């Protein structure tokens, strides 16, 4: 969804929610277990702090 | 009596080598054959 994107992205996608990576990076740029679950988990791009 | 004979032209063109060269130096374009070289 353009208005909101699920952080995981599919069960409870709407509940899970509250380029997709660019939209979701807003909260992360400005932590929890299970990080190494989705394919997007990677430290190449800057996603610290 | 069997011998050899000949026939020659009439108007004909012939000039000396020196005069031929002198004429060729400047007359190459004035006339169109029949009186030069």
């Amino acid at each position: 969804t353009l208005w909101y994107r699920a952080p995981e992205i599919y069960s409870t996608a709407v509940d899970i929610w509250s380029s997709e990576i660019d939209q979701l990076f807003r909260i992360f740029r400005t932590v929890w277990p299970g990080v190494t679950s989705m394919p997007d988990y990677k430290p190449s791009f800057p996603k610290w702090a | 009596w069997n011998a050899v004979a000949l026939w020659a032209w009439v108007c004909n063109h012939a000039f000396h080598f020196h005069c031929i060269s002198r004429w060729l130096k400047t007359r190459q374009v004035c006339p169109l054959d029949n009186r030069e070289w």
Binding site: T36, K42, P43, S44 | -
Partner: protein, 212 residues
């Protein structure tokens, strides 16, 4: 119908058909199986990508005698040389300290590509122990004597820009030029030169063991 009085090569033949997950799950069954679990004939092409392993696992794998293996797209943050002829550590920055600790001494690596790794000078020349390498890198890596072993560096300084193609052995098939070509001293579609891939097979040798 006892299954504990068989030769060793028969068990090797049995194991040769297994894939990674099943093999590593069968690694531990009894004392007899443990010795044959890790053998030279088994590990010859091991490609794990994106598994962000820890130093103990890689140390054990290298010590076990892995003939040749590649490892693209795998990040690492946390000696007796073995035949690791083919290596692929590309576009996955790793801690320089651990790299120097483990990559201090390698006897012979006919293929050694380190594409996209920041390592400084004191360990670059230590590769001279290798008998001869015929592969180079151009992805952001002593300065002149290294290539004498066999006969896009932003941090690279100006002094050694012209040294490469000026006074160095040129028996190599090719010397790729890009980015630094414009600044190269004059007094001195896609590109598939000095790259591993043009289908997990890499460098032309099939990966007999890939996690995927």
């Amino acid at each position: 119908v006892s299954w504990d009085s068989l030769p060793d090569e028969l068990l090797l033949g049995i194991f040769s058909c297994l894939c990674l997950p099943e093999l590593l799950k069968v690694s531990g069954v009894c004392k007899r199986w443990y010795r044959l679990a890790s053998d030279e004939s088994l590990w010859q092409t091991l490609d794990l990508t994106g598994k962000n392993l820890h130093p103990d696992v890689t140390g054990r794998l290298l010590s076990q005698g892995v003939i040749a293996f590649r490892c693209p797209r795998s990040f690492m943050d946390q000696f007796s040389p073995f035949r690791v002829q083919h290596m692929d550590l590309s576009n996955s920055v790793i801690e320089v300290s651990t790299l120097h600790g483990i990559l201090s001494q390698c006897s012979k690596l006919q293929n050694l590509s380190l594409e996209g790794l920041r390592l400084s000078d004191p360990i670059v020349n230590t590769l001279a122990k290798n008998s001869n390498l015929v592969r180079l890198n151009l992805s952001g890596c002593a300065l002149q004597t290294l290539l004498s072993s066999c006969s896009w560096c932003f941090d690279f300084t100006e002094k050694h820009v012209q040294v490469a193609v000026a006074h160095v052995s040129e028996t190599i098939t090719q010397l790729n030029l890009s980015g630094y070509r414009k600044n190269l001293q004059k007094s001195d579609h896609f590109t598939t030169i000095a790259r591993p891939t043009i289908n997990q097979e890499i460098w032309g040798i099939k990966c007999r063991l890939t996690l995927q």
